[PDB]
Amino acid sequence: ETHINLKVSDGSSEIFFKIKKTTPLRRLMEAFAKRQGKEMDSLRFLYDGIRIQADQTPEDLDMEDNDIIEAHREQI
User: Fold this and answer.
1) Which family, according to UniProt?
2) CA distance 23 to 49
3) Which helix (H) or strand (E) holds 14?
């Protein structure tokens, strides 16, 4: 899609790296799951507090250029 940087934020899981693709939804999908996913104890995908994202839209990534989302915890 586009060459931009990605930044996954979470409780204690915070990783920042550059990627050759804006698509965050797909990015964080692994990225975040690459840092926190290790514990697979967090399955809360949101941006603020309404299961939202930054550029989770394939129509936004094509435009905007900034992959960043939050991965909260959700496993009782």
Assistant:
1) Belongs to the ubiquitin family. SUMO subfamily.
2) 21
3) none
Alpha-carbon gap, residue 10 to 12, rounded angstroms: 5
Experimentally, the structure was elucidated by NMR
Q: How many CB atoms are located within 10 Å of the residue 72 CB? A: 17
Domain map of the chain by residue range? 1-76
The CATH code for residues 1-76 is: 3.10.20.90
Pairing of strands 15-19, 4-9: antiparallel
SS3 assignment for 43-73:
CEEECCCCCCCCCCCCCCCCCCCCEEEEEEC
